[PDB]
């Protein structure tokens, strides 16, 4: 995108529709009460909603459908600061819309608080934030590892892997925090029910967890060594042509710094 | 099929048997009452019935086993108007038979209304139609994306993806409309119980949803640009030989229109 | 096997251990009462036991672990009459052992009738046999289609496909017949509890269903055309060397019959 | 590792974090009571936790996250005595930490005994040990078969296969022993609750089962013939350079023993 990338705006639309669908189906399947089979069912719904959407638009935008996941990819230097923000914008509006459309087609009484992420009475906000961190951490770690082109021919469906990771996060987390693992998914129910009690947990946990996962993977487990050069050349895009010059100032690592950053 | 395509009639048989099996097992596993674990179980049964059948005959006919899905592929210009109708005919008779055979081997009292798709009292037919649309939309979107030859080597089983998409549709939709997502599957229980109350919902929602999914994908997310030429040459078949002429009137894009449509 | 096939006896051992494990875990997870979540759990246990075993020994023996499945492969002309019988022998003793070892480590009271396949009071033995036929039919059809080397690169795990097919059979069938789909699995509980009431259903249904699936696939859906020559040369083995002769009586389709069957 | 293997210490970190996550999520999802849906949920949680972690770090360390599994690979001669011990050390501390972090963020009353593996009153410790053996045996067998580079292109995700094998172990075993299948996972709850009643079962069963699986596979089902030479050269590492000599004492199988072990 400094020339004819409709395959940037298609991805933005992907993230928008996938987030609407993700939230619409995730929240919709969470309406009511109950954890025994309630948890299993909601865990599977979110997991399968993600696996479905990652198959649907994973090849088009990477299927982030999650600000925390996009953030993970930003600090991981795999997308530009521009795409990230557009992705999150699309995801936030996408979620709100799905939550909206969900509200419009769902009978009251069943609506409840639209599956608003909520902490368990006996769980402090600090504990809940650590939980949300671990949930998103294993989640992002699974995303990075499975999206990683440098590995496996025995991966199977990465869409399912990621989805089942989300399911795992719910199977464990719902009892604690209803499992947010996704700012956008927590936001949607929040802004429509005018209730931001403890909402900070659902942005901070996933974001930190997402950051730790990106870190844990890229800077330790399976390093994806990138020089500050490429890193910066990533959160800004524009690569690698357009410049002027027949031989062009580009060559010979002679300590002359780098012939411009 | 203007010469020796038994691999058109084999596919028709595939769609017929798969629809019988699909409906037979889906309806059969839905007999009774209950949603908590009822939903999880029925959602999985349909999902696994589809994943099973898509593995079984997906390579033979594409495993549509769903008029709405076939319709999706028609407006998507991936099959002829002839195949589509034959597919739907096979699917409708296939479903009815499965529902029939199901009735014949199932004890009354347990038969109920043969898992007839039904709306929830607090859900208007308009809301129910929007639900059925979203259900089929994410469903078809998953089918198009996963069937798309232009993508992934990390897809895993597309049969499972599609099946789990169907499961997702049920995990969410059953509470609202019992989740139709398939005219044929709704039809079968309908024509055998002589009850078409709200049946319009189960044809309109999936069909519109299927149409929106085909559109959303082909004309936006991952465009499959086809000229009106090929499009029309698709819903009619007959390609590309038989014509007469040594050099044959075929060549030079000189604005002469197209040397016949 | 008319020279140094330890890779025939390894497969026999595979079928023996897999059947012991299959029955041991399937029956073990079925002990108790309950269908709501009972069915879901037992359906998954068998399905995952199979998917596990098909991954474990599928490359070694094809992981039949089921007389009906082996029978399916026999009439399908994919194995010799010798292997089939040895397979079934291994599977029958394998099952009995697993059921045995299961009994030995399971507390009474919980033992019940060792998950003996049983018909539902309101289900006639004729209806139950048709159910068992459809269960095994979709099952075998999934096995043939997924084992078929002539297809898909988007199959994902065929072990899971097959396993989930088994799960589907249970999700539907357990309420009717407890879902046998496997003579050996029905036999084991039978011979150890000295109860063969309706046992005929559990041999006849799967066998006929297995036969119909093999047929439905090979002689209709995706034909695997084999001349009576190869067919017979299959249920007898011994191919294709050993004969004597420099030019050897083998050649020229001149209607001379076939230079010996 | 007698030169610059950070890709030995990265794997150790992998095993450490994966074990923390594995135990953290497995134990966390097991807190409470109930088996009907309790079992299904806990079986899935562990299974999906493993499938997730095997995707996450399977390409980095083989994702053992289980002393018994590592032991299996040791006697299977696929890792050095050095790696094995470091792996188990990382797994044991990893588990304890996860159990620790779990305790710190979980409300009391819900903490119980931190999902300590426990035998069923009517199950003798001898029976329980045989159960744990079969659980780990089918588990390890699935791991060996699916990790085996010498097979399948239809494997799908080996991470899911392995995970579902673990789920199967739980679906069956939880009623008997709560299903340990992993010393580290049993240890963590044990050392933090100061309760080692019957703990011997949870080391002995998996270890023996793991040993039998490694054996059953490597020395029978699909032999991986290795000469005592390579075997020993494996549990010690250091291969194959560093030696001195232009032609070097290496060659001609003339019965001279082997030119040094």
PDB file of N, CA and C in Angstrom, chain C residues 112-175:
ATOM      1  N   UNK C 112     -21.572 -54.161  35.550  1.00  0.00           N
ATOM      2  CA  UNK C 112     -22.826 -54.346  34.836  1.00  0.00           C
ATOM      3  C   UNK C 112     -22.741 -55.572  33.948  1.00  0.00           C
ATOM      4  N   UNK C 113     -23.088 -55.415  32.674  1.00  0.00           N
ATOM      5  CA  UNK C 113     -23.009 -56.517  31.721  1.00  0.00           C
ATOM      6  C   UNK C 113     -21.869 -56.227  30.747  1.00  0.00           C
ATOM      7  N   UNK C 114     -20.869 -55.498  31.237  1.00  0.00           N
ATOM      8  CA  UNK C 114     -19.704 -55.114  30.445  1.00  0.00           C
ATOM      9  C   UNK C 114     -20.066 -54.410  29.141  1.00  0.00           C
ATOM     10  N   UNK C 115     -21.029 -53.498  29.216  1.00  0.00           N
ATOM     11  CA  UNK C 115     -21.469 -52.743  28.050  1.00  0.00           C
ATOM     12  C   UNK C 115     -21.863 -53.665  26.894  1.00  0.00           C
ATOM     13  N   UNK C 116     -22.635 -54.693  27.217  1.00  0.00           N
ATOM     14  CA  UNK C 116     -23.107 -55.632  26.214  1.00  0.00           C
ATOM     15  C   UNK C 116     -24.046 -54.877  25.278  1.00  0.00           C
ATOM     16  N   UNK C 117     -23.854 -55.026  23.968  1.00  0.00           N
ATOM     17  CA  UNK C 117     -24.736 -54.361  23.023  1.00  0.00           C
ATOM     18  C   UNK C 117     -26.136 -54.893  23.289  1.00  0.00           C
ATOM     19  N   UNK C 118     -27.091 -53.985  23.399  1.00  0.00           N
ATOM     20  CA  UNK C 118     -28.458 -54.366  23.694  1.00  0.00           C
ATOM     21  C   UNK C 118     -29.493 -53.534  22.951  1.00  0.00           C
ATOM     22  N   UNK C 119     -30.579 -54.188  22.552  1.00  0.00           N
ATOM     23  CA  UNK C 119     -31.658 -53.510  21.851  1.00  0.00           C
ATOM     24  C   UNK C 119     -32.572 -52.783  22.826  1.00  0.00           C
ATOM     25  N   UNK C 120     -33.206 -51.725  22.332  1.00  0.00           N
ATOM     26  CA  UNK C 120     -34.146 -50.933  23.113  1.00  0.00           C
ATOM     27  C   UNK C 120     -35.482 -51.692  23.052  1.00  0.00           C
ATOM     28  N   UNK C 121     -36.181 -51.819  24.195  1.00  0.00           N
ATOM     29  CA  UNK C 121     -37.467 -52.522  24.298  1.00  0.00           C
ATOM     30  C   UNK C 121     -38.449 -52.244  23.160  1.00  0.00           C
ATOM     31  N   UNK C 122     -38.570 -50.976  22.773  1.00  0.00           N
ATOM     32  CA  UNK C 122     -39.482 -50.613  21.705  1.00  0.00           C
ATOM     33  C   UNK C 122     -38.931 -50.772  20.301  1.00  0.00           C
ATOM     34  N   UNK C 123     -37.734 -51.337  20.187  1.00  0.00           N
ATOM     35  CA  UNK C 123     -37.103 -51.548  18.886  1.00  0.00           C
ATOM     36  C   UNK C 123     -37.103 -53.038  18.540  1.00  0.00           C
ATOM     37  N   UNK C 124     -37.763 -53.403  17.446  1.00  0.00           N
ATOM     38  CA  UNK C 124     -37.810 -54.805  17.053  1.00  0.00           C
ATOM     39  C   UNK C 124     -36.412 -55.219  16.605  1.00  0.00           C
ATOM     40  N   UNK C 125     -36.133 -56.520  16.610  1.00  0.00           N
ATOM     41  CA  UNK C 125     -34.818 -56.995  16.192  1.00  0.00           C
ATOM     42  C   UNK C 125     -34.608 -56.705  14.708  1.00  0.00           C
ATOM     43  N   UNK C 126     -35.707 -56.619  13.965  1.00  0.00           N
ATOM     44  CA  UNK C 126     -35.612 -56.328  12.546  1.00  0.00           C
ATOM     45  C   UNK C 126     -35.235 -54.873  12.335  1.00  0.00           C
ATOM     46  N   UNK C 127     -35.835 -53.994  13.133  1.00  0.00           N
ATOM     47  CA  UNK C 127     -35.549 -52.571  13.041  1.00  0.00           C
ATOM     48  C   UNK C 127     -34.115 -52.324  13.496  1.00  0.00           C
ATOM     49  N   UNK C 128     -33.734 -53.013  14.565  1.00  0.00           N
ATOM     50  CA  UNK C 128     -32.403 -52.902  15.142  1.00  0.00           C
ATOM     51  C   UNK C 128     -31.319 -53.357  14.178  1.00  0.00           C
ATOM     52  N   UNK C 129     -31.662 -54.312  13.325  1.00  0.00           N
ATOM     53  CA  UNK C 129     -30.719 -54.851  12.358  1.00  0.00           C
ATOM     54  C   UNK C 129     -30.556 -53.864  11.210  1.00  0.00           C
ATOM     55  N   UNK C 130     -31.623 -53.129  10.905  1.00  0.00           N
ATOM     56  CA  UNK C 130     -31.571 -52.143   9.836  1.00  0.00           C
ATOM     57  C   UNK C 130     -30.752 -50.964  10.348  1.00  0.00           C
ATOM     58  N   UNK C 131     -30.914 -50.650  11.628  1.00  0.00           N
ATOM     59  CA  UNK C 131     -30.163 -49.560  12.231  1.00  0.00           C
ATOM     60  C   UNK C 131     -28.682 -49.916  12.191  1.00  0.00           C
ATOM     61  N   UNK C 132     -28.350 -51.112  12.665  1.00  0.00           N
ATOM     62  CA  UNK C 132     -26.962 -51.549  12.679  1.00  0.00           C
ATOM     63  C   UNK C 132     -26.374 -51.542  11.274  1.00  0.00           C
ATOM     64  N   UNK C 133     -27.221 -51.793  10.277  1.00  0.00           N
ATOM     65  CA  UNK C 133     -26.795 -51.805   8.881  1.00  0.00           C
ATOM     66  C   UNK C 133     -26.435 -50.391   8.437  1.00  0.00           C
ATOM     67  N   UNK C 134     -27.306 -49.428   8.714  1.00  0.00           N
ATOM     68  CA  UNK C 134     -27.023 -48.051   8.334  1.00  0.00           C
ATOM     69  C   UNK C 134     -25.796 -47.502   9.073  1.00  0.00           C
ATOM     70  N   UNK C 135     -25.659 -47.863  10.346  1.00  0.00           N
ATOM     71  CA  UNK C 135     -24.531 -47.422  11.157  1.00  0.00           C
ATOM     72  C   UNK C 135     -23.228 -47.881  10.520  1.00  0.00           C
ATOM     73  N   UNK C 136     -23.152 -49.175  10.234  1.00  0.00           N
ATOM     74  CA  UNK C 136     -21.955 -49.750   9.656  1.00  0.00           C
ATOM     75  C   UNK C 136     -21.756 -49.318   8.214  1.00  0.00           C
ATOM     76  N   UNK C 137     -22.857 -49.073   7.511  1.00  0.00           N
ATOM     77  CA  UNK C 137     -22.791 -48.643   6.119  1.00  0.00           C
ATOM     78  C   UNK C 137     -22.107 -47.279   5.941  1.00  0.00           C
ATOM     79  N   UNK C 138     -22.526 -46.282   6.711  1.00  0.00           N
ATOM     80  CA  UNK C 138     -21.922 -44.957   6.612  1.00  0.00           C
ATOM     81  C   UNK C 138     -20.496 -45.062   7.130  1.00  0.00           C
ATOM     82  N   UNK C 139     -20.311 -45.935   8.110  1.00  0.00           N
ATOM     83  CA  UNK C 139     -18.998 -46.144   8.701  1.00  0.00           C
ATOM     84  C   UNK C 139     -18.021 -46.688   7.667  1.00  0.00           C
ATOM     85  N   UNK C 140     -18.372 -47.814   7.054  1.00  0.00           N
ATOM     86  CA  UNK C 140     -17.527 -48.453   6.050  1.00  0.00           C
ATOM     87  C   UNK C 140     -17.319 -47.549   4.851  1.00  0.00           C
ATOM     88  N   UNK C 141     -18.377 -46.858   4.458  1.00  0.00           N
ATOM     89  CA  UNK C 141     -18.310 -45.937   3.336  1.00  0.00           C
ATOM     90  C   UNK C 141     -17.252 -44.871   3.599  1.00  0.00           C
ATOM     91  N   UNK C 142     -17.164 -44.419   4.849  1.00  0.00           N
ATOM     92  CA  UNK C 142     -16.190 -43.406   5.242  1.00  0.00           C
ATOM     93  C   UNK C 142     -14.793 -44.004   5.225  1.00  0.00           C
ATOM     94  N   UNK C 143     -14.697 -45.266   5.626  1.00  0.00           N
ATOM     95  CA  UNK C 143     -13.415 -45.953   5.645  1.00  0.00           C
ATOM     96  C   UNK C 143     -12.902 -46.130   4.218  1.00  0.00           C
ATOM     97  N   UNK C 144     -13.736 -46.689   3.345  1.00  0.00           N
ATOM     98  CA  UNK C 144     -13.342 -46.890   1.957  1.00  0.00           C
ATOM     99  C   UNK C 144     -12.947 -45.581   1.285  1.00  0.00           C
ATOM    100  N   UNK C 145     -13.804 -44.574   1.392  1.00  0.00           N
ATOM    101  CA  UNK C 145     -13.524 -43.287   0.779  1.00  0.00           C
ATOM    102  C   UNK C 145     -12.236 -42.647   1.288  1.00  0.00           C
ATOM    103  N   UNK C 146     -12.003 -42.704   2.599  1.00  0.00           N
ATOM    104  CA  UNK C 146     -10.806 -42.095   3.197  1.00  0.00           C
ATOM    105  C   UNK C 146      -9.525 -42.913   3.058  1.00  0.00           C
ATOM    106  N   UNK C 147      -9.661 -44.217   2.874  1.00  0.00           N
ATOM    107  CA  UNK C 147      -8.499 -45.083   2.708  1.00  0.00           C
ATOM    108  C   UNK C 147      -8.084 -45.074   1.238  1.00  0.00           C
ATOM    109  N   UNK C 148      -9.051 -44.756   0.381  1.00  0.00           N
ATOM    110  CA  UNK C 148      -8.864 -44.705  -1.062  1.00  0.00           C
ATOM    111  C   UNK C 148      -7.678 -43.828  -1.450  1.00  0.00           C
ATOM    112  N   UNK C 149      -6.643 -44.457  -1.991  1.00  0.00           N
ATOM    113  CA  UNK C 149      -5.440 -43.735  -2.392  1.00  0.00           C
ATOM    114  C   UNK C 149      -5.688 -42.805  -3.574  1.00  0.00           C
ATOM    115  N   UNK C 150      -6.748 -43.080  -4.319  1.00  0.00           N
ATOM    116  CA  UNK C 150      -7.069 -42.288  -5.495  1.00  0.00           C
ATOM    117  C   UNK C 150      -7.677 -40.923  -5.205  1.00  0.00           C
ATOM    118  N   UNK C 151      -7.674 -40.479  -3.947  1.00  0.00           N
ATOM    119  CA  UNK C 151      -8.279 -39.182  -3.655  1.00  0.00           C
ATOM    120  C   UNK C 151      -7.641 -38.278  -2.597  1.00  0.00           C
ATOM    121  N   UNK C 152      -8.157 -37.049  -2.569  1.00  0.00           N
ATOM    122  CA  UNK C 152      -7.809 -35.942  -1.673  1.00  0.00           C
ATOM    123  C   UNK C 152      -6.415 -35.705  -1.117  1.00  0.00           C
ATOM    124  N   UNK C 153      -6.109 -34.417  -0.985  1.00  0.00           N
ATOM    125  CA  UNK C 153      -4.858 -33.942  -0.425  1.00  0.00           C
ATOM    126  C   UNK C 153      -5.331 -32.963   0.639  1.00  0.00           C
ATOM    127  N   UNK C 154      -6.649 -32.969   0.824  1.00  0.00           N
ATOM    128  CA  UNK C 154      -7.345 -32.135   1.789  1.00  0.00           C
ATOM    129  C   UNK C 154      -8.140 -33.059   2.715  1.00  0.00           C
ATOM    130  N   UNK C 155      -7.659 -34.286   2.872  1.00  0.00           N
ATOM    131  CA  UNK C 155      -8.322 -35.271   3.718  1.00  0.00           C
ATOM    132  C   UNK C 155      -8.129 -35.013   5.208  1.00  0.00           C
ATOM    133  N   UNK C 156      -6.973 -34.464   5.567  1.00  0.00           N
ATOM    134  CA  UNK C 156      -6.668 -34.240   6.965  1.00  0.00           C
ATOM    135  C   UNK C 156      -6.359 -35.625   7.497  1.00  0.00           C
ATOM    136  N   UNK C 157      -6.666 -35.878   8.764  1.00  0.00           N
ATOM    137  CA  UNK C 157      -6.427 -37.186   9.367  1.00  0.00           C
ATOM    138  C   UNK C 157      -7.559 -38.166   9.018  1.00  0.00           C
ATOM    139  N   UNK C 158      -7.237 -39.272   8.359  1.00  0.00           N
ATOM    140  CA  UNK C 158      -8.295 -40.223   8.027  1.00  0.00           C
ATOM    141  C   UNK C 158      -8.660 -41.008   9.288  1.00  0.00           C
ATOM    142  N   UNK C 159      -7.723 -41.064  10.235  1.00  0.00           N
ATOM    143  CA  UNK C 159      -7.941 -41.743  11.506  1.00  0.00           C
ATOM    144  C   UNK C 159      -9.077 -41.041  12.264  1.00  0.00           C
ATOM    145  N   UNK C 160      -9.044 -39.703  12.292  1.00  0.00           N
ATOM    146  CA  UNK C 160     -10.081 -38.921  12.963  1.00  0.00           C
ATOM    147  C   UNK C 160     -11.404 -39.027  12.218  1.00  0.00           C
ATOM    148  N   UNK C 161     -11.345 -38.953  10.888  1.00  0.00           N
ATOM    149  CA  UNK C 161     -12.549 -39.050  10.072  1.00  0.00           C
ATOM    150  C   UNK C 161     -13.292 -40.331  10.419  1.00  0.00           C
ATOM    151  N   UNK C 162     -12.561 -41.434  10.351  1.00  0.00           N
ATOM    152  CA  UNK C 162     -13.091 -42.749  10.655  1.00  0.00           C
ATOM    153  C   UNK C 162     -13.606 -42.781  12.096  1.00  0.00           C
ATOM    154  N   UNK C 163     -12.799 -42.278  13.025  1.00  0.00           N
ATOM    155  CA  UNK C 163     -13.210 -42.237  14.419  1.00  0.00           C
ATOM    156  C   UNK C 163     -14.493 -41.435  14.619  1.00  0.00           C
ATOM    157  N   UNK C 164     -14.572 -40.262  13.998  1.00  0.00           N
ATOM    158  CA  UNK C 164     -15.765 -39.436  14.130  1.00  0.00           C
ATOM    159  C   UNK C 164     -16.963 -40.071  13.457  1.00  0.00           C
ATOM    160  N   UNK C 165     -16.710 -40.925  12.466  1.00  0.00           N
ATOM    161  CA  UNK C 165     -17.796 -41.645  11.795  1.00  0.00           C
ATOM    162  C   UNK C 165     -18.362 -42.626  12.826  1.00  0.00           C
ATOM    163  N   UNK C 166     -17.463 -43.277  13.561  1.00  0.00           N
ATOM    164  CA  UNK C 166     -17.856 -44.228  14.596  1.00  0.00           C
ATOM    165  C   UNK C 166     -18.641 -43.481  15.677  1.00  0.00           C
ATOM    166  N   UNK C 167     -18.167 -42.294  16.038  1.00  0.00           N
ATOM    167  CA  UNK C 167     -18.833 -41.464  17.039  1.00  0.00           C
ATOM    168  C   UNK C 167     -20.247 -41.143  16.574  1.00  0.00           C
ATOM    169  N   UNK C 168     -20.378 -40.777  15.302  1.00  0.00           N
ATOM    170  CA  UNK C 168     -21.675 -40.455  14.715  1.00  0.00           C
ATOM    171  C   UNK C 168     -22.600 -41.668  14.848  1.00  0.00           C
ATOM    172  N   UNK C 169     -22.071 -42.849  14.530  1.00  0.00           N
ATOM    173  CA  UNK C 169     -22.846 -44.073  14.626  1.00  0.00           C
ATOM    174  C   UNK C 169     -23.393 -44.272  16.027  1.00  0.00           C
ATOM    175  N   UNK C 170     -22.593 -43.909  17.025  1.00  0.00           N
ATOM    176  CA  UNK C 170     -23.003 -44.032  18.416  1.00  0.00           C
ATOM    177  C   UNK C 170     -23.976 -42.933  18.821  1.00  0.00           C
ATOM    178  N   UNK C 171     -23.693 -41.696  18.421  1.00  0.00           N
ATOM    179  CA  UNK C 171     -24.565 -40.582  18.764  1.00  0.00           C
ATOM    180  C   UNK C 171     -26.001 -40.885  18.351  1.00  0.00           C
ATOM    181  N   UNK C 172     -26.150 -41.604  17.248  1.00  0.00           N
ATOM    182  CA  UNK C 172     -27.471 -41.966  16.748  1.00  0.00           C
ATOM    183  C   UNK C 172     -27.930 -43.315  17.286  1.00  0.00           C
ATOM    184  N   UNK C 173     -27.112 -44.337  17.037  1.00  0.00           N
ATOM    185  CA  UNK C 173     -27.435 -45.702  17.425  1.00  0.00           C
ATOM    186  C   UNK C 173     -27.543 -46.188  18.864  1.00  0.00           C
ATOM    187  N   UNK C 174     -26.761 -45.636  19.781  1.00  0.00           N
ATOM    188  CA  UNK C 174     -26.820 -46.101  21.158  1.00  0.00           C
ATOM    189  C   UNK C 174     -28.233 -46.244  21.747  1.00  0.00           C
ATOM    190  N   UNK C 175     -29.119 -45.301  21.443  1.00  0.00           N
ATOM    191  CA  UNK C 175     -30.487 -45.335  21.958  1.00  0.00           C
ATOM    192  C   UNK C 175     -31.274 -46.526  21.425  1.00  0.00           C
TER     193      UNK C 175
END
